[PDB]
């Protein structure tokens, strides 16, 4: 997410367009954007088309015009010596497609090649007219869009969804790299800078959880320090782990430690799960998802989050305020977790409502306890406290003395209502978490991990997920092409080291140049048995499952395999809120808005229209009078309900009297006539 942020191109700013007054001609994909701005990765709401992303090979020239590399072709030969062009320059040449047939002899194998003629007009053209060539078939997309395998099999909308969703995944407690990645994951991780790279070559001397020490080749020692359990701008957890031993020799530029979402120096935003593609009892209905209970017991999709509570003691007109255990009216029992200074003990357990920093301010004794409390719905463990004291000549703001700060961290397991997604725009919330006993299990007794409904795929034109599932099964199972008597014709153009693989092999399919369908069929045709000479998945890629709830086998085979699932930052613990009474606004005496000051849900104008169309006058009247801004009515209704009385009658709202006063202030004699 940060790397994508650093490479953004925005049109709205002090000197640019406007988010509303901008038309539909500036939110378009222009032919000149080929290779300079990614056409897929844009926001989805009002900023659609106004914020873009720079491409991968593109650069900016001194005057501010973006350039993109091209490979000069001379006399019909695709030569070396890349030359950087601009849109203005590129408009007076003919450039060819990167994924084009060449035979290492500077002469196209096929007669005709699609080329952007002048105004981005793709055309079949004679082979002698080409003047330039794209560097790779991965040149128009950005960094995040280049990490979607089988991108060319997905429609633009779902590809945009997946590219945007890849930037919302939370770092899991333990990271694991995909099995079916693309390749743009090692450089993406190294350039992002969240990994630790050895400054200079040498031999590891002492490696610990907190520090690496490389003994350089000149007698110098440089100790790297790892940042453990730090907090990001968005509450996630940043944690570095060394991945080298005490005797290994490292080289300059080698990855010496891992980061939040990295595994061996490659991005790892999700986990590999065994999936089934059948409908099941209506629980995965309308984009809902079904998970096994193994992913909770074994902590497969668990994450750590950190909060930041800060409070300071001002000078105050009253004069002076102190933080200490001396909180009046409270027994020592409640202050058990508090210490001599006033802050809580590191390693303590805090629940919703608990003194974290006990203080008192004399509001004029006048001492008034305004101690920090754990927000509603918060809990965890206090893992760190930072206190800046004016007595220690700290760089504090003006008019303060102490700036004590606290950290509480808690591990969150996957629950019902959390959002998951793949890399192909397949999103959904968790409808149910079944016990691992009543789950469809293969003939050998292995349950599936996740179930995805069939009705969502063919409609949304994101078939890439099925191909990913097939190839993930092939990679996990391991395979061996039987070239006993010549390599099979479907493996003729398959590189060696790919004719055979061992279980849990990691492969890569570049974004626009990867595995063909014939290769997928061939690999599905030859996979290794599990423990016994049994192949659980046949050539079609479909297995024969058993009903764990009844025991009978399902009548037909089901598609099974391994796909890569990510856990988005849209957890249900953050989206649940309720209220009966609490803080109110001051001018228009209505409840406040927001989950963070209790606050109430707003009954808008279209809801009023609906209630009026139902012909329900009394519910509407109570909603608009006694639940919102009838000051006496609220207290009387509460006192009536707590007792067994009947609800009183509503009065006059409080937003009408304000309007009357404003109209009078505009020099208008407004009166109510009986």
């Amino acid at each position: 997410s940060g790397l994508t942020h650093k490479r953004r191109l925005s049109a709205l700013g002090p000197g640019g367009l406007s988010r509303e007054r901008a038309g539909l001609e500036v939110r378009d994909v222009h032919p000149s954007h080929y290779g300079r701005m990614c056409p897929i990765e844009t926001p989805e709401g009002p900023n659609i088309g106004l914020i873009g992303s720079l491409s991968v090979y593109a650069r900016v020239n001194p005057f501010g015009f973006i350039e993109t590399p091209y490979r000069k072709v001379v006399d019909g030969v695709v030569s070396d010596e890349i030359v950087y062009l601009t849109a203005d320059e590129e408009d007076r040449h003919v450039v060819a497609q990167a994924n084009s047939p060449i035979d290492a002899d500077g002469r196209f194998v096929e007669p005709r090649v699609l080329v952007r003629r002048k105004a981005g007009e793709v055309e079949y053209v004679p082979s002698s007219e080409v003047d330039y060539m794209d560097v790779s078939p991965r040149q128009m997309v950005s960094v995040a869009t280049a990490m979607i395998p089988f991108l060319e099999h997905d429609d633009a909308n779902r590809a945009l969804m997946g590219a945007n969703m890849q930037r919302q995944a939370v770092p899991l407690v333990r990271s694991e790299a995909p099995l079916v990645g693309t390749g743009m994951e090692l450089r993406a991780a190294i350039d992002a800078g969240d990994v630790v790279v050895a400054e200079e070559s040498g031999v590891i001397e002492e490696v610990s959880a907190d520090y690496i020490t490389v003994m350089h080749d000149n007698g110098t020692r440089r100790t790297y320090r790892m940042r453990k359990f730090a907090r990001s701008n968005h509450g996630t957890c940043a944690n570095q782990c060394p991945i080298v031993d005490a005797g290994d020799r490292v080289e300059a530029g080698q990855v010496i430690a891992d980061g939040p979402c990295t595994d061996d120096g490659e991005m790892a935003l999700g986990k590999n799960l065994l999936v089934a593609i059948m409908p099941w009892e209506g629980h995965n209905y309308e984009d809902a998802i079904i998970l096994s209970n193994r992913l909770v017991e074994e902590d497969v999709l668990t994450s750590i989050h950190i909060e930041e509570h800060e409070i300071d003691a001002r000078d105050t007109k009253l004069g002076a305020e102190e933080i200490t255990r001396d909180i009046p009216n409270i027994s020592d029992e409640v202050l058990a977790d508090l210490d001599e200074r006033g802050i809580v003990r590191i390693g303590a357990e805090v629940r919703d409502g608990d003194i974290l920093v006990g203080k008192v301010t004399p509001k004029g004794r006048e001492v008034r306890d305004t101690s920090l409390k754990v927000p509603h719905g918060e809990s965890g463990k206090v893992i760190g406290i930072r206190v800046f004291s004016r007595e220690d000549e700290d760089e504090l703001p003006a008019g303060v003395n102490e700036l004590v700060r606290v950290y509480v961290a808690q591990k969150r397991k996957i629950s019902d209502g959390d959002k998951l997604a793949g890399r192909h725009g397949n999103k959904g919330v968790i409808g149910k978490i079944l016990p691992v006993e009543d789950m469809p299990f293969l003939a050998d007794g292995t349950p599936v991990d996740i179930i995805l409904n069939t009705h969502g795929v063919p409609r949304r034109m994101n078939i890439g997920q099925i191909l990913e599932t097939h190839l993930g099964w092939c990679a996990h199972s391991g395979w061996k092409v039987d070239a006993a008597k010549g390599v099979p014709d479907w493996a003729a153009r398959l590189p060696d080291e790919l004719l055979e693989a061992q279980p849990n092999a990691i492969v890569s399919t570049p974004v626009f140049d990867g595995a063909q369908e014939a290769e997928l069929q061939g690999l599905l045709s030859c996979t290794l048995p599990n423990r016994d000479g049994d192949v659980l998945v046949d050539a079609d890629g479909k297995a024969m499952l058993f009903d764990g709830r009844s025991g009978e086998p399902f009548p037909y085979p089901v598609t099974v395999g391994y796909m890569y699932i990510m856990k988005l930052h849209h957890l249900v613990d953050d989206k649940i809120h309720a209220r009966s009474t609490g803080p109110y606004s001051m001018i228009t005496q209505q409840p406040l808005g927001g989950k963070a000051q209790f606050g109430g849900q707003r009954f808008g104008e279209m809801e009023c229209w609906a209630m009026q169309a139902y012909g329900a006058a009394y519910t509407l009247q109570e909603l608009l009078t006694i639940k919102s801004d009838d000051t006496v009515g609220r207290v009387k209704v509460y006192e009536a309900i707590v007792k067994g009385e009947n609800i009183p009658e509503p009065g006059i709202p409080e937003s009408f009297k304000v309007l009357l006063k404003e109209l009078q202030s505009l020099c208008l004699n407004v009166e109510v006539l009986s």
Partner: peptide, 30 residues
């Protein structure tokens, strides 16, 4: 067949690619 042969300590992730890349991806923060 492998993906990243330039980075010294890289995992051996094998690739299905058929086309050679003349140029290396530039620095992404340049």
């Amino acid at each position: 067949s492998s993906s990243n042969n330039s980075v010294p300590g890289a995992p051996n992730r094998v690739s299905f690619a058929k086309l050679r890349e003349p140029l290396e991806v530039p620095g992404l923060l340049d």
